[PDB]
């Protein structure tokens, strides 16, 4: 965990969290983590260019008290190394919604029944350049 | 309670940190802290509408291992309760430079000789809406 870590986010349901940043020239993997704290994540958002046996695949998971849940994978991969990218995230009682920069959108279940998101962290081959709250 | 806290900022000399946010309708005081950690601050930036015996005055200080340094006060006060505001900050070996939204700029000495800013925190009657790097 070398990237930006933010706490006291107070993101509420329906409010969009917009994260923009720079993908390394030789990016292999990058991560955006959201939740209560570092061991309790409603969203581990992990686009893998080539990491852990996945190629050009977004892997999402939850983390409950340090234990990873069951993974969800997405096919579309709107990212390129050496480029800027932007992701928007919101949530409700049921799911998190991830808005991808190619205009694609997908859902990830709110397994931990989180009513507020207080923690974000960036990791991997990504440097945050802008974080915005609606 | 404290607003947004961010660590692993990796702000280098000459790089600009842009913070935009909402001032409470009845704002009395707000704070932006920058430095290494919560006890070691190269910049405590505290516009006071009416707090601690100051009226409409920006109070700046450093904090070295929990101890406040010698205060610096600025006359101009380009802030209004209930409005959005934006501050931009950079630094070099000698000083921090604070760029105010009325176009004013002033300097605060880099007393702790910080070569990198790792930590930021918002506090008081201010809700961060956007943080951007540089
Ligand atoms: O689930 C998120 C974590 O996945 C870990 O890798 C998994 C991998 O995705 C899976 O296919 C299998 O190989 O088991 C691995 C367990 O280590 C990553 O190591 C971790 O960083 C998270 O992304
Ligand atoms: O120096 C920053 C801190 O100031 C504290 O208040 C000062 C006040 O500004 C000064 O005029 C004198 O009265 O001593 C006070 C206590 O040190 C604030 O309480 C603190 O929050 C910082 O802003």
Curated annotation (Swiss-Prot), chains A, B:
Gene Ontology cellular-component terms listed: cell surface; cytoplasm; extracellular space; galectin complex; plasma membrane
User: What's in the keyword line of the UniProt record?
Assistant: Acetylation, Apoptosis, Cytoplasm, Extracellular matrix, Lectin, Phosphoprotein, Secreted
Protein localization: Secreted, Extracellular space, Extracellular matrix; Cytoplasm; Secreted
Q: Which residues bind a beta-D-galactoside?
A: 44-48, 52, 61, 68-71
Biological processes per GO annotation: apoptotic process; cell-cell adhesion; cellular response to glucose stimulus; myoblast differentiation; negative regulation of cell-substrate adhesion; negative regulation of neuron projection development; negative regulation of T-helper 17 cell lineage commitment; plasma cell differentiation
The Swiss-Prot or TrEMBL record annotates one GO molecular function as: laminin binding
Stretches of the chain forming a coiled coil according to its record:
none
Gene3D superfamilies for the chain? 2.60.120.200
UniProt-listed Pfam families? Gal-bind_lectin (PF00337)
Listed PANTHER family: GALECTIN, GALECTIN-1
Provide the function of this protein.
Answer: Lectin that binds beta-galactoside and a wide array of complex carbohydrates. Plays a role in regulating apoptosis, cell proliferation and cell differentiation. Inhibits CD45 protein phosphatase activity and therefore the dephosphorylation of Lyn kinase. Strong inducer of T-cell apoptosis. Plays a negative role in Th17 cell differentiation via activation of the receptor CD69.
What interactions and quaternary structure are annotated? Answer: Homodimer. Binds LGALS3BP. Interacts with CD2, CD3, CD4, CD6, CD7, CD43, ALCAM and CD45. Interacts with laminin (via poly-N-acetyllactosamine). Interacts with SUSD2. Interacts with cargo receptor TMED10; the interaction mediates the translocation from the cytoplasm into the ERGIC (endoplasmic reticulum-Golgi intermediate compartment) and thereby secretion. Interacts with CD69.
Name recorded for this polypeptide: Galectin-1
